[PDB]
Amino acid sequence: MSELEKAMVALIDVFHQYSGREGDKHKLKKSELKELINNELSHFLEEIKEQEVVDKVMETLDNDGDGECDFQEFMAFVAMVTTACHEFFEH
Amino acid sequence: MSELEKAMVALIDVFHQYSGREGDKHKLKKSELKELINNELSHFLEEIKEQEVVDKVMETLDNDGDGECDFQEFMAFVAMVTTACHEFFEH
Ligand SMILES: [Ca+2]
Ligand SMILES: [Ca+2]
Ligand SMILES: [Ca+2]
Ligand SMILES: [Ca+2]
Ligand SMILES: [Ca+2]
Ligand SMILES: [Ca+2]
Ligand SMILES: [Zn+2]
Ligand SMILES: [Zn+2]
């Protein structure tokens, strides 16, 4: 696999790892999302230590209102954070 | 970096590699897009050997009509292919 291909597979993997912990195994509940951010985005996003932050993040990414992050919504979240990384550095 | 973080950086890298070849260094023209697909998505997408295919792919991903793929549009493309990978395997 190319680096791009590897990257795509890594997005699927991390989503499955976390989504599979509780409840619907193809969606991230707030707790799962919190830990994904805290463990796997520790360089790109401030650690979440407040309920109000978990709440706001989920509210922001949860486009279908079910209170969880599904795969499509996780893809959008990844794009948001990737874009923020891209922009953060002037080039 | 986590695997997720690495993946995000890899998306930015591959986009820059290809977008930087010609013209606007932050957009993929048809030729750049063709080679990105052919070289870096060789396991996930059929090799592009026809103009009509390059044309259709660009038309499909080009949401702002400028005839190129920008970073946002590339993110959407990556999500599309990642999703197709995810679904292709029943689990
Ligand atoms: Ca879950
Ligand atoms: Ca389990
Ligand atoms: Ca949702
Ligand atoms: Ca270009
Ligand atoms: Ca050059
Ligand atoms: Ca465009
Ligand atoms: Zn850039
Ligand atoms: Zn799955």
Residue A82 Cα to chain centre, angstroms: 11
The residue whose two tokens read 């995810």 is: B86
Residues in chain B with CB shorter than 8 Å from the CB of A79 are 72, 75-76, 78-79
Q: Is B61 on the interface with A (CB under 8 A)?
A: no
Could you name the CATH architecture of B1-91?
Orthogonal Bundle (1.10)
Give the bridge partners for B69, in sequence order: B28
Angle at B77 between CA A35 and CA A8, to 5 degrees: 45
Question: Which residues does A47 contact at the CB level (< 8 Å), separation at least 6?
Answer: A37, A38
Residues in chain B with CB shorter than 8 Å from the CB of A10 are 3-4, 6-7
Question: Resolution reached, in Å?
Answer: 1.4
Three-state secondary-structure class, residue A15: helix
Q: Output the six-digit token pair for B51.
A: 């103009």
Give the CA diameter of chain A. Answer: 43
Q: Output the six-digit token pair for B44.
A: 């996930």
**Residue extents of the structural domains in chain B:** 1-91
Instruction: Tally Cβ neighbours within 10 Å of residue A5.
Output: 20
Q: From the CA of B55, how many Å to the nearest CA of chain A?
A: 22
Q: Output the six-digit token pair for A85.
A: 């990384």
Which residue from B36, B2, B72, B77 is spatially nearest to A84, judged by alpha carbons? B72
Q: From the CA of A51, how many Å to the nearest CA of chain B?
A: 23
